[PDB]
């Protein structure tokens, strides 16, 4: 469950809220959530927006049209799933359609991250064919703003900038390793770059979360290492001998 790398999207599940608390509060817990099993496929909502004209006569440079973002919509979420009329959850789905109330429903992704929306049923279909299991197709029109998985995400910048260099001699044809700790009390979410100070006696390669330093020419060389936008940095000095 790494929410910083791409995922294959298999194992995603779907639930509908059946409690009375705050669905947006704790969507990680599936206590008061009824699962819709046998989900054939799912098309999530499309968060769109409408534009307002932002062109005034008093403006200079009237050659290019200008706009601005207005209200935003939460789109419709569709999904088809195996038709099981005797299974509770489908009965709850038809009750949701008939009563027509606005209810919350969450989608659990195979990252540990969830996406909970809130809407009402606007379509209940069904495809009947031989040699293929009967499917029930549902469409939910969403209202208001939903809680994306990027809302529950957290960042950490606890200032743990540590640089451990080799700080030893290197020779022609060999290389040395430079290490940068990315543990501001462990958790981190940033990036960094490193480069030599001359590019005439030594070369650097920043990969594998390490720095490979190659002494093409002898002498004293320096390597700045700056993390992120420039929040923190360090300097390493490496000696290259004639031998």
């Amino acid at each position: 469950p790494n929410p910083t790398m791409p995922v294959k999207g298999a194992g995603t599940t779907l639930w509908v809220y059946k409690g009375s608390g705050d669905p947006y509060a704790n969507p990680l817990s599936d206590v008061d959530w009824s699962r819709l099993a046998k989900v054939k496929d799912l098309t999530p909502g499309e968060l769109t927006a409408e534009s307002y004209d932002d062109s005034y006569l008093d403006d200079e440079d009237a050659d290019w049209t200008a706009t601005g973002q207005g209200q935003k919509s939460a789109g419709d979420t569709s999904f088809t799933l195996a038709w099981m009329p005797g299974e509770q959850g489908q009965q709850a789905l038809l009750a949701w359609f008939n009563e027509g109330d606005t209810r919350a429903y969450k989608i659990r992704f195979p990252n540990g991250t969830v996406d909970v929306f809130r809407g009402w049923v606007s379509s209940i279909g069904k495809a009947v064919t031989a040699k293929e299991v009967i499917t029930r197709t549902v469409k939910v029109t969403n209202v208001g703003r939903p809680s994306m998985a990027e809302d529950r995400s957290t960042v950490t910048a606890a200032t743990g900038m540590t640089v451990t260099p080799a700080s030893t001699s290197v020779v022609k044809g060999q290389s040395t390793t430079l290490t940068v700790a990315f543990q501001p009390e462990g958790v981190t979410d940033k990036s960094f770059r490193a480069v030599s100070a001359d590019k005439t006696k030594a070369t650097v390669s920043v990969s594998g979360m390490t720095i490979t330093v190659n002494g093409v020419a002898a002498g004293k060389v320096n390597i700045p290492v700056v993390s992120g936008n420039g929040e923190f940095a360090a300097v390493a000095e490496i000696t290259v001998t004639a031998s």
């Binding site: 307002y52 004209d53 005034y56 006569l57 008093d58 207005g70 209200q71």
Partner: protein, 109 residues
Amino acid sequence: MKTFRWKVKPGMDVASVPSVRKVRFGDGYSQRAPAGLNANLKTYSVTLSVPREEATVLESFLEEHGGWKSFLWTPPYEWRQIKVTCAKWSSRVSMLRVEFSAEFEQVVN
């Protein structure tokens, strides 16, 4: 305040209608005079569109003059500052914006 600062978006309507004295003689002949002594005043049918919070400021500015009184404005037509009076400033409210319609009449006063 004195100067109108908000901008006019869509393309206003500028009406001239100079007042003249006209006499229609008989077989196609006529007589025409400028009636007045000082030019033509011209009026602007103007529309603003402003966020729901600046609408209160716009309404307060237009109310402080209250139909009478003249404020300075530089129309985006001839780009010369003139003195105008506004007496309607209707306003339609929306979800995130308010659209104002007004008739600015230029006055020598």
